[PDB]
Amino acid sequence: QTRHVVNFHSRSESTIENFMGRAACVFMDQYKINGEETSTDRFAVWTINIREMAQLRRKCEMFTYMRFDIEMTMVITSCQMPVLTHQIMYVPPGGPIPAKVDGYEWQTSTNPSVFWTEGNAPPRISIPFISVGNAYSSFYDGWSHFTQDGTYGYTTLNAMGKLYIRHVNRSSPHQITSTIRVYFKPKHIKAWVPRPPRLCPYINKRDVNFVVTEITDSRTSITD
Amino acid sequence: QTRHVVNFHSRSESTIENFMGRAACVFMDQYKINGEETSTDRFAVWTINIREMAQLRRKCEMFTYMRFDIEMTMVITSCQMPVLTHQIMYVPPGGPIPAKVDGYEWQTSTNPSVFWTEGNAPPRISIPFISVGNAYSSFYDGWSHFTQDGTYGYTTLNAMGKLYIRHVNRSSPHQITSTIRVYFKPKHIKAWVPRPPRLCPYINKRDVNFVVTEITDSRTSITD
Amino acid sequence: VRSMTLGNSTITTQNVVVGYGEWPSYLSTAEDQPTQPDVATCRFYTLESVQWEKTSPGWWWKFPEALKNMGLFGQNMHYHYLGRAGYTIHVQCNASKFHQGCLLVVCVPEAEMGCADTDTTFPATELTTEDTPHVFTSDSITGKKVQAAVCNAGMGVGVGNLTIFPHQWINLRTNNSATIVIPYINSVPMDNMFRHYNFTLMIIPFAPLNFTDGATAYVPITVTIAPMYAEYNGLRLA
Amino acid sequence: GVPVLNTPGSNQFLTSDDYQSPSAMPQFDETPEMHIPGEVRNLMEIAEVDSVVPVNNVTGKTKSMDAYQIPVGDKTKPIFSFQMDPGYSSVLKRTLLGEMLNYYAHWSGSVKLTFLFCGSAMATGKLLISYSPPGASVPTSRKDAMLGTHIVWDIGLQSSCVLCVPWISQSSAGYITCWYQTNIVVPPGAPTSCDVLCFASACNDFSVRLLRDTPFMA
Amino acid sequence: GVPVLNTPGSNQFLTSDDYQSPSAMPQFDETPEMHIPGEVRNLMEIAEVDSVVPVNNVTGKTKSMDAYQIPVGDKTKPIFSFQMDPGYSSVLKRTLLGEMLNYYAHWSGSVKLTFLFCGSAMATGKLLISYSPPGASVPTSRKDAMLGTHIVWDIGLQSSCVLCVPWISQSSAGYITCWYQTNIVVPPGAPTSCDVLCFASACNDFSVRLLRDTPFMA
Amino acid sequence: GVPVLNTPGSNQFLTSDDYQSPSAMPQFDETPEMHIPGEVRNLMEIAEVDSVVPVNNVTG
């Protein structure tokens, strides 16, 4: 490459909506169709949170507070029959969860769910700003239980819900193993209180713990 | 045939947009679905450039500078099952590339990709004028590395990106060999600095090297 | 007869082909600020005269760096890594009345030339020898150098329809002088003057020189370049 | 919602359509357009540029620049002669004119020819440039060329004679022959043999309709 | 009803589209927006904030806060020197400036540097801060740095000298060297060795185009 | 976007329809219409022309 005259004047790509509002795959998972009537491998879960993969988590940690609608579009495949129909049930933060693929929770009227049959366009489900407070908090320097009990750094305001996914087909002659790819996307996003970027690598998906990393890459002397 | 009175007055077919803006197939390639977990024959590449086939390259070499949006529509087939879903990932000039079909680069949020399932209309992805400069240069009488180093005639301004294409299905019982046909089309095209047409045949797809060809077809005498 | 002068360089001249109907001009930001030399730079830089015999196939110069050793322009190329100019190019021929011939004086922006034996490149000193011109050849040549055969000048095009560019015919029957103004054709407003050759002044004899056994065996072609509206990057802080 | 019904032609891919492509980079704002000199806004602006025509393209003079040179200096046979059609003619098929016309099937218009005499400033003679209509036969003699359409082009006065040949179209053409009216009269100092260059472009305006692929590329 | 026909691109999933998503909770009315202090409405508002630059990032001083401290108090070799490009430069790559610029491929603008002298209130000396253009070579001596662009920064008068480096873009950069014009003159009571902190931000306005993924995260 | 629903009769091919066919040659501009003598604009303009009637159409 060579250093060219990069002559233009624009910051429309640096706005918050043009920086955060990009769809990224945040959840791959497998789920069967038949066998093991009492099993946990016939449906998916994925509790919705921004701390899924480090690349997007890093961007969410530029800002302390942010509020945004989410508009996820699933991309569902299958391996190994009839034409298959799926169900992607979003439960709100206050919502019952299934324990099995044949639980009664799947029939709850307050849990919205899409019934996507195979072959069509991917299913798209949009969720508004659910949180109790006025913004989602990326960081919470506080304790969930009063008087400095356990569970540091976890507030219940930045709870977004869960996403239970199953086949609606009761059975099949052979085994069908479906794969789902949830594409998370912030929408109509506002952000408050900027924050310095992450320096150290991430350790765990529910905490801010880190190993002390060097500031920058080292050089030989101060003058070279 | 016979010489007829071709009586009309029109040059709307001779404009630049009615001369360059025509879809042409520029990339056939095969890619499997299963086997050889570490292989390069399970995805396609095609670095996007105008110097693909000589018929369109000749037209792009009528003009020194030109700028245009590109709107390519892929035509994907299959041979030998479930219903298949594909992924056509366009990476920008500044973008990470996959090394395997199961690399992490496929999940990059800044690389836009279409997820086309088989049976529908062909997938269409449109790319704007990416280049750093103010036009794409068909010819570059210059050196990439300063002080007359290697790599003559290759500037980094006329870089358009790449187009990684794979199956999203993880596996299959039998072998499925998909074929893709990328239909490149310039759009909203402007062109500067006209240039004489190519006379000699093309040798290689990254240079202007040629064999000295005769000007025109020869005749017997100057007077016949 | 008009005696043009620029700075401390006066030439004697005898119609101008303004390249692409535009006259060169300046670029008109505090993030990137150009410096306009104006002083010097604009004077006439007369290259070495070139003898045109009966068997001369042609010549080419690659600018802007053909002037890389030409005074203050050639020296500002080394201190600024970005620039642009206009290059008024006078081409006299001062032949006699009994000489005959015809020249194509064309500028050809972005003349990407091809290697003589393809499947390889050339060592970068074959495109340009600063002030002195690389001649064409009458037939095909081999080796790691530029395929300099006329009828396929440098780019693999026909040499006859090389007239699409800013050109001027010098027919010794009628005229002797040519002048072309090339208003910096490039896709970026400024570019480095050592990497990129903005255009290629090539003089190609279509009708060959001819004369009898008493005249001088050659016709010296004089090339003069005046870099107009040269501007560079800024070296000062903001 | 809105009751729609898909017509025949839904979910197909017609290669030549002008539909609104969904942009893959919507946030992306493209580079501002600067003014670059020499914009082309129509292809027939290339055909209107004169360019040298290889009239002397005989069997051994096409890989040199002797193809463009018409030798001047026998008065019974013409100097040169060629079909007047930029397509399917060895002389006018690789001209800018003749090359921007092989991209098209239907074209119709006129074509101007400039004959630049590249001899000495002391050589003087006359050449008779005859034109045959597209149906007529070629003149076999100089007198028979004089009785048709011609222009006795005095070299000693003007050194560039311009034609404008009409009725040029395809979807059996004219002839531009040239004759020795007089020989080239030359003083003792100047050379005896001279050359004549030719040119070709679109005369006033050119019409052209049906785009196709060029035959030259393989 | 209405005769429609599906174009190419129907029933596909382009990742980067801006279509009206059908809301899953239509009855649901979201919480009213209160005013929270410190809203960000553009990313380049983070790049305009000064932040300390680790100039002294030598091989054993990068996991401590000795990386940010330029030791002041041999006049033949410069105090410090570094490439002037927030990308692909060890000194300016983890700055707020240099970190909001690794999210993008095309960026162009200027950058201002503040040199805060953190010595005593009695220490007095001169430092010569030279700037080399992106094509030029570094000054090997103090005189050769004085003949180019420089600012003889008197410490005893002002304790903070601000630059503004233009022509900073990527899609071979400048140099900010610093020299001992004079040594640090100090009374008997004050300490002899001092430190100089550095800062960096966007000078006036910064341009930035093509978003990408950052290299730092793995 | 716009909530549409396909009616019965979608994705069929009725032979006698008058829908907007997507043109295969959009850039192409067709030949101008000259005036040719004797235009027919209705078929019953042929029936109004007298013509000889074979009344004596016996067997031979």
Author numbering:
A (entry chain S), B (entry chain P): 1043 to 1122, 1132 to 1275
C (entry chain Q): 2013 to 2026, 2030 to 2043, 2048 to 2257
D (entry chain R), E (entry chain U): 3001 to 3073, 3078 to 3175, 3187 to 3233
F (entry chain a): 3001 to 3060
Give verbatim excerpts from the published study on this entry.
Viruses from the family Picornaviridae form non-enveloped icosahedral virions that are about 30 nm in diameter. The capsid proteins VP1, VP2, VP3, and VP4 originating from a single polyprotein form a protomer, the basic building block of the icosahedral capsid. The entire capsid consists of 60 such protomers, arranged in 12 pentamer units. Here we show that the exit of the RNA from the particles of echoviruses 18 and 30 requires capsid opening and results in a loss of up to three adjacent capsid protein pentamers.
Specifically, we performed cryo-EM of echovirus 18 virions exposed to pH 6.0 for 10 min, mimicking the acidic environment that the virus encounters in endosomes. Asymmetric reconstruction combined with 3D classification identified subpopulations of echovirus 18 particles that lacked up to three pentamers of capsid protein protomers. We call the particles lacking one or several pentamers open particles. The missing pentamers always formed a single compact opening through the capsid. The absence of one pentamer of capsid protein protomers creates a 120 Å-diameter pore in the capsid. The openings formed by the removal of one or more pentamers are sufficiently large to allow release of the viral RNA, even if the genome contains double-stranded RNA segments. Reconstructions of the open particles missing one, two, or three pentamers with imposed five-fold, two-fold, and three-fold symmetries, respectively, were determined to resolutions of 3.8, 4.1, and 3.7 Å, which allowed their molecular structures to be built. Except for the missing pentamers, the open particles are similar in structure to that of the activated echovirus 18 particle: increased diameter relative to the native virus, reduced inter-pentamer contacts, absence of VP4 subunits, and holes along icosahedral two-fold symmetry axes. The capsid proteins next to the missing pentamers are more mobile than the rest of the capsid, as indicated by the three times higher temperature factors than the remainder of the capsid. Residues 1–42 from the N termini of VP1 subunits, which were previously shown to interact with membranes and facilitate enterovirus genome delivery into the cytoplasm, are not resolved in the electron density map, indicating that their structures differ among particles.
